[PDB]
Design a protein around this ligand. Structure first.
Ligand SMILES: CN[C@@H]1[C@H](O)[C@H](NC)[C@H]2O[C@@]3(O)C(=O)C[C@@H](C)O[C@H]3O[C@@H]2[C@H]1O
Ligand SMILES: [K+]
Ligand SMILES: [K+]
Ligand SMILES: [Mg+2]
Ligand SMILES: [Mg+2]
Length: 163
RNA sequence: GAGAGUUUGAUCCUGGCUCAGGACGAACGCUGGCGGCGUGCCUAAUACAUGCAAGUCGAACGCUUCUU
């Protein structure tokens, strides 16, 4: 668990989807907002908020995202190793990149990575474009990412021996 | 190793279609200052006026026309 407090979190509105519930009189229109809130230092989360008005949906989503913050391993400006994250339709593949290459990624993955604070990475989305699913798939891949120190500790060998 | 639009009242998935890039012996439209380097019948191996694109050797040979 990562406490939102003590972290200077900033948010970005990934998607604002106007959803409809059909009611006897007609259409009941609501706004569903997907938000990604991150620390630019390795912590990031995503939250969903539904409300009659766009600002309120965004605010609800922001609070949810803070609750869901997670930490991403990072070696320099890029991730430790290649990782594929799959959630539902979403399917993302993210690879380390050389320094200065930038963030090669599309749409929602861009927000997740920027907010997380990763500056250089290569990513490809092999699944659907559904923003919620791709964001979920992104965080799944990041949770798969492993630290050299943790791996070295787990396997019982020095990190130098591992590499 | 970037995506985006579009099926629905709304949603996820599947799925096609379309677009954002680059390329060219290009052509067309509008427009048009210069220079360097390059390229220019992709079609009818269709038909071709005209001129030229294969001559040279007198130290292999015998002739023949003029200059004093
Ligand atoms: C018989 N009275 C109806 C009934 O109460 C409906 N709710 C069950 C009620 O529904 C509404 O309140 C609605 O929300 C829909 C609207 C077409 O009619 C409205 O009035 C509707 C009332 O007129
Ligand atoms: K349509
Ligand atoms: K599609
Ligand atoms: Mg939830
Ligand atoms: Mg020809």
């Amino acid at each position: 668990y990562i406490d939102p407090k003590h972290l200077e979190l900033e948010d970005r509105v990934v998607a604002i989807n106007r959803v409809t519930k059909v009611v006897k009189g007609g259409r009941r229109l609501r706004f569903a907002a997907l938000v990604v809130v991150g620390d630019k230092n390795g912590h990031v989360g995503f939250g969903t908020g539904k409300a009659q008005e766009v600002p309120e949906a965004i605010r609800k989503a922001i609070e949810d995202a803070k609750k869901n913050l997670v930490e991403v391993p990072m070696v320099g400006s890029t991730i430790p190793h290649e990782v594929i994250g799959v959630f539902g339709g979403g399917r993302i593949l993210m690879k380390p990149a050389v320094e200065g290459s930038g963030v090669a990624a599309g749409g929602p993955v861009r927000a997740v990575l920027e907010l997380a604070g990763v500056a250089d990475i290569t990513s490809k989305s092999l699944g659907s474009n559904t923003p919620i699913n791709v964001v979920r798939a992104t965080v799944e891949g990041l949770k798969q990412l492993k630290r050299a120190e943790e791996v070295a500790a787990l396997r019982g060998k020095s990190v130098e021996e591992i590499i």
